[PDB]
Amino acid sequence: QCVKLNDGHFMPVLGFGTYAPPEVPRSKALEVTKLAIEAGFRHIDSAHLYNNEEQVGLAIRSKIADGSVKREDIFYTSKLWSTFHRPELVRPALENSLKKAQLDYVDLYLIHSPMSLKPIFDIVDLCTTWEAMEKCKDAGLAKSIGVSNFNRRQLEMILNKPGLKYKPVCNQVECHPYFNRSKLLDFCKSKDIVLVAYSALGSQRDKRWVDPNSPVLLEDPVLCALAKKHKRTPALIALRYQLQRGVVVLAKSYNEQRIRQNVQVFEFQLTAEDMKAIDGLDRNLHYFNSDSFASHPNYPYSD
Ligand SMILES: NC(=O)c1ccc[n+]([C@@H]2O[C@H](COP(=O)([O-])OP(=O)(O)OC[C@H]3O[C@@H](n4cnc5c(N)ncnc54)[C@H](OP(=O)(O)O)[C@@H]3O)[C@@H](O)[C@H]2O)c1
Ligand SMILES: Cc1ccc(Cl)c(Nc2ccccc2C(=O)O)c1Cl
């Protein structure tokens, strides 16, 4: 199913994560994005950063061409990279992502991160970036626009902007049972802004930003015990948890069995006691924990 965004467009509540590290050949993105769509995924999450938009776009066009889905059945997201926050660069960055994917529009375009980088850190008024995003929705390049990696204060700056035309429809952020973002989720609900969870399965644990000593979410004993009770898997429990909280959840998998497994999130439900047990795992733990973000003036977790 779908959630109605605050601009009247609809977003599928389970999305397919397409990021893979650079050691995975670029051709894999094409193959697994096809498999995801075959499995039942209708929301596909990509970004300029991922260096896969040509493959992801080809998978979508491929599944349109062979007749499995129509373009309006697919919800495709791309994201403005942090070297393109200066307002005059926004629309050209978007049109480029479009030309790569060979699509006429994205369903959603996000500001990937509030941490501006030189076109080295940069200082940009993200309110001007936002105006440029608004112009992209007006031109029909993006059906909806939103943000990613914004904390409550950063999100407030946009919402409070003089002559704001469109609220962000969502804030895509790190979110899972060890970092459940409860307070930010309540703030977003109060504003009819959807929270979209990434690393909802505990991240890819890439050594470039994640400490390998960090706990492994999918071996959590409470998650294992609920998977046993429901006869599902720890990943399924972690995804269902977000859906029942009114959180749109992404799931990356480049594995054919796990891709098909993940759409089973719709086939069962958790009780209030289950949800409380998961809620009790929260431990303020963000897996991405790197000097490369932490020292930025607009680091979202400076809290
Ligand atoms: N906005 C941002 O700054 C940001 C940041 C991070 C991620 N994202 C978006 O969110 C997407 C997902 O987040 P993520 O990449 O951190 O990964 P994720 O969804 O947390 O998944 C982490 C690992 O879970 C494994 N997995 C998937 N399904 C599973 C299952 N059923 N059972 C066991 N393991 C399973 C996958 O390994 P296999 O591939 O081997 O199955 C995957 O590498 C990204 O791909 C990207 O689209 C955005
Ligand atoms: C904290 C933070 C800040 C900025 C970005 Cl862009 C990201 N996103 C990524 C970082 C490294 C590799 C992939 C991503 C992603 O968007 O998937 C995160 Cl996790």
Swiss-Prot record:
Q: Which PROSITE patterns match?
A: ALDOKETO_REDUCTASE_1 (PS00798), ALDOKETO_REDUCTASE_2 (PS00062), ALDOKETO_REDUCTASE_3 (PS00063)
The record's Pfam families line, in alphabetical order, gives: Aldo_ket_red
Q: In which pathway does it act?
A: Steroid metabolism
Residues recorded as binding substrate, renumbered to this chain, are: H112
Which residue positions are annotated as catalytic? Y50
Annotated keywords: Cytoplasm, Lipid metabolism, NAD, NADP, Oxidoreductase
Reaction it catalyzes = a 3alpha-hydroxysteroid + NADP(+) = a 3-oxosteroid + NADPH + H(+); a 3alpha-hydroxysteroid + NAD(+) = a 3-oxosteroid + NADH + H(+); prostaglandin F2alpha + NADP(+) = prostaglandin D2 + NADPH + H(+); prostaglandin F2alpha + NADP(+) = prostaglandin H2 + NADPH + H(+)
Involved in ligand recognition and product release (site feature) positions: W209, F288
GO annotation, biological process: cellular response to calcium ion; cellular response to corticosteroid stimulus; cellular response to jasmonic acid stimulus; cellular response to prostaglandin D stimulus; cellular response to prostaglandin stimulus; cellular response to starvation; daunorubicin metabolic process; doxorubicin metabolic process
The protein's site described by Important for substrate specificity is found at L49
Specify which residues bind NADP(+) according to the UniProt entry for this protein.
18-19, 45, 148-149, 172, 198-204, 252-254, 258-262
The family note in this entry says: Belongs to the aldo/keto reductase family.
Its protein name is Aldo-keto reductase family 1 member C3
Give the gene that encodes this protein.
AKR1C3
